[PDB]
Design a protein around this ligand. Structure first.
Ligand code: SF4
Ligand code: NI
Ligand code: NI
Length: 729
């Protein structure tokens, strides 16, 4: 049996209980359950017991309840017994265990109150607007899971209350955002940060939940991790708490004047293993060592929370004028805020990584050749050519394309730095706010140098960065860059599932999905969409002991569906033996599993005789009778699910795309925007198959319908080949 409570046994010596804290927790838990009970009785009197209740866009009903006790709450009456249960577990005796049970009851009460609040919520007339999030949908949790698994998001800060001043709120939050922690904000700190023009919203991984009971939208976010990637069953309470403590490195920052309900909520965080750190001074009888502690000095509170939680940060430490971290990757710079730009079809541009010989490379040398961003009035433009020379003993020409990709990400982490595209199609923008802080191309070169030295210590011994901004000179060197681009394109042309004798595992997502195993082949990218076969091969050649390992293609069992003994044995050994077999070219029998970060899901529809596909960003209903989030609840979690499978979007353009099932010809329904994202690949592959370039017009989408009865007549009138193919079954 998991004995999770053992994690608290050292906290309080007997007879020295902090009775002020336990009394405040008791009063706040009773108040929260009472709030929830009256609002529930009123709603049941007004709408009736059977009225549906729930949150927008989640597969997990009321996730806090769904995780800790497993109930599938759907209607108001379902809430009644649960709340009664929770009220019954609030007890006067002042023990640490009773405080934790009161905190769980407070969390249950906040979840109930919020679902009741959402009874009045419609997408057309919502109860919250951006940047505020309220309840955060499943797609955002999944969209940041990939950053969680490799600790690009080292942890999470749940900040409730009010910083002593708005400037202090801005400082601690800018610090956290530069450390890459995911933030949940509640109460007056939000307006404090907005008045300091701190950037907030889901794009910045800094969620303004709202006030008061909206605090629970951090809890139901965190618990979803274990429900989704961890695959833990609903209702396995101690297993969920153990997943939270082990992998959701959250802590609470309790700022400003205390009140009973906030304190009971923080105790609910402690109940699942998240320490609480407050800016208030604390008497002995209102603190718990390593669980409810005071750090009044704002200069130290962040490092205090990080150390008590166990979070370790690895910053490049270079003193750059602008903030840097994952939160800023998703920013975009409006034309009115843009100080200068390069590339994007407005000026010549290229970026290139290139291996060099040892004797004429100067490690750390960052040079800007040509005018700097000093040169232009705001809104102007310059050419940019970036060349990162690299020498290392164990550097390989193979690594050049891989490291080149990093530039995009390295640039977008800078606040006011923006980057898109690649090679000679780059577009880069620098905001007026960054220019006013002193940012110049020098800092871009130093940033790329430090991030390359930090991310590849084993293979980079020397790195040099040159940024050219003369038009003619950029055009001249762009031809050399294009030469290297063509070489890489040819090496990529040579690869195929048959020509290579080694496929590659990837185990990264096992930090959160312990049983999941990805197998990457030249014609099948990993389901995150970011790990191609060349990427896994380079990661293994750089770190032989890492999460990517070679697997020889041996012991063939089924050439058609794509089963080999070697991959079977590897997946069985590395899946904690939940998975014995896997077919690479079909979803209908022994499909590869998923963690929860798949870019899209495929599913077989017998009534259409073919596949639907739905990407994570699509909002609406699909012909199988489920949204992407509901389908993802079944497809993720490391279980084998014949007839369903998660995939990267680019996989749809592979020649091996579910080849044993009929490939692209079997696809009958995709979202319109997904078809348009992939229009060129789909047209080219469809012509290769003999389906015609107009085959994309025969694929149904949501503008055709969202049910089988609406879609089938369109497929029949359009003569879709899948209808005349063999049923998959
Ligand atoms: S390839 Fe698979 S396991 Fe690796 S990061 Fe991508 S989704 Fe996760
Ligand atoms: Ni994942
Ligand atoms: Ni995943």
């Amino acid at each position: 049996v998991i004995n999770f409570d053992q994690i608290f046994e050292g906290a309080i010596e007997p007879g020295k209980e902090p009775k002020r804290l336990f009394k405040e927790v008791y009063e706040g838990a009773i108040t929260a359950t009472s709030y929830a009970e009256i609002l529930l009785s009123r709603a049941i009197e007004k709408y009736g017991p059977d009225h549906p209740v729930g949150y927008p866009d989640t597969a997990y009903f009321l996730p806090v309840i769904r995780a800790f006790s497993g109930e599938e709450v759907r209607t108001l009456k379902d809430m009644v017994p649960i709340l009664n249960r929770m009220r019954a577990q609030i007890k006067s005796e002042l023990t640490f265990e009773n405080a934790r049970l009161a905190g769980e009851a407070t969390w249950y009460a906040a979840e109930i109150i919020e679902a009741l609040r959402y009874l009045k919520h419609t997408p057309e007339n919502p109860i919250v607007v951006p940047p505020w999030t309220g309840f955060i949908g499943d797609p955002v949790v999944r969209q940041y899971g990939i950053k969680m698994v490799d600790w690009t998001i080292p942890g999470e800060a749940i900040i409730i209350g009010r910083a002593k001043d708005s400037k202090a709120a801005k400082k601690i939050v800018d610090d956290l955002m530069g450390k890459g922690l995911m933030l949940f904000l509640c109460d007056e700190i939000i307006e404090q940060l907005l008045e300091e023009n701190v950037k907030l919203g889901v794009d910045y991984i800094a969620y303004p939940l709202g006030n008061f009971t909206q605090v629970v939208h951090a809890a139901n976010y965190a618990l979803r991790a274990g429900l989704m990637f961890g695959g833990i069953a609903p209702g396995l309470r101690d297993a969920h708490r153990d997943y939270q403590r082990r992998r959701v490195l959250a802590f609470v920052l309790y700022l400003g004047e205390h009140d009973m309900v906030k304190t009971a909520a923080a105790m609910g965080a402690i109940f699942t293993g998240f320490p609480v750190i407050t800016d208030q001074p604390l008497p002995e009888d209102k603190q718990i060592k390593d669980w409810f502690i005071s750090e009044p000095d704002y200069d130290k509170i962040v490092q205090t929370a990080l150390e008590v939680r166990g979070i370790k940060i690895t910053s490049i430490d270079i003193d750059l004028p602008i903030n840097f971290g994952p939160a800023f990757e998703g920013e975009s710079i409006r034309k009115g805020d843009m100080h200068v730009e390069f590339g994007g079809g407005k000026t010549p541009s290229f970026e290139l990584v290139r291996m060099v010989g040892p004797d004429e490379i100067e490690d750390g040398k960052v040079e800007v050749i040509g005018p700097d961003i000093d040169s232009v009035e705001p809104g102007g433009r310059l050419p940019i050519g970036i060349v990162v020379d690299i020498y290392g003993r164990k550097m390989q020409e193979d690594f050049e394309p891989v490291l080149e990709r990093r530039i995009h990400y390295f640039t977008n982490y800078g606040e006011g730095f923006w980057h898109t595209a690649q090679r000679d199609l780059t577009w880069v923008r620098i905001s007026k706010e960054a220019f006013a802080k002193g940012a110049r191309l020098k800092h871009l070169g130093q940033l790329l140098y430090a991030k390359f030295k930090q991310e590849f210590p084993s293979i980079v011994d020397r790195v040099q960065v040159t940024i050219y901004t003369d038009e003619q000179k950029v055009l001249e060197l762009r031809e050399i860059a294009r030469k290297k681009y063509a070489e890489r394109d040819a090496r990529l042309r040579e690869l195929s599932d048959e020509a290579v004798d080694t496929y590659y595992s990837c185990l990264l997502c096992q930090s959160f999905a312990p049983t999941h195993v990805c197998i990457v082949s030249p014609e099948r990218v990993g389901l995150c969409g970011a790990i191609s076969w060349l990427d896994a091969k380079a990661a293994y050649e750089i770190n032989p002991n890492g999460p990517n390992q070679p697997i020889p293609k041996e012991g063939l069992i089924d050439p058609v569906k794509g089963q080999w003994e070697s991959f079977n044995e590897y997946i069985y050994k590395n899946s904690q033996r939940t998975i014995e077999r896997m077919n690479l070219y079909t979803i209908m029998e022994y499909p590869m599993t998923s963690c929860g970060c798949f870019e899209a899901i495929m599913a077989y529809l017998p009534e259409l005789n073919g596949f639907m596909i739905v990407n994570r960003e699509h909002s609406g209903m699909t012909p199988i009778g489920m949204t992407f989030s509901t389908l993802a609840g079944m497809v993720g979690g490391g279980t084998q699910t014949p007839g369903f499978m998660g995939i990267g979007k680019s996989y749809i353009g592979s020649r091996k795309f579910v080849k044993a099932d009929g490939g692209l010809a079997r696809v009958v329904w995709m979202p319109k925007d997904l078809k348009e994202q992939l229009r060129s690949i789909i047209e080219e592959r469809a012509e290769e198959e003999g389906l015609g370039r107009d085959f994309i017009d025969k694929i149904a989408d949501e503008t055709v319908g969202t049910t089988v009865d609406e879609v089938l007549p369109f497929l029949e009138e359009k003569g879709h080949p899948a209808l005349s193919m063999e049923p998959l079954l």
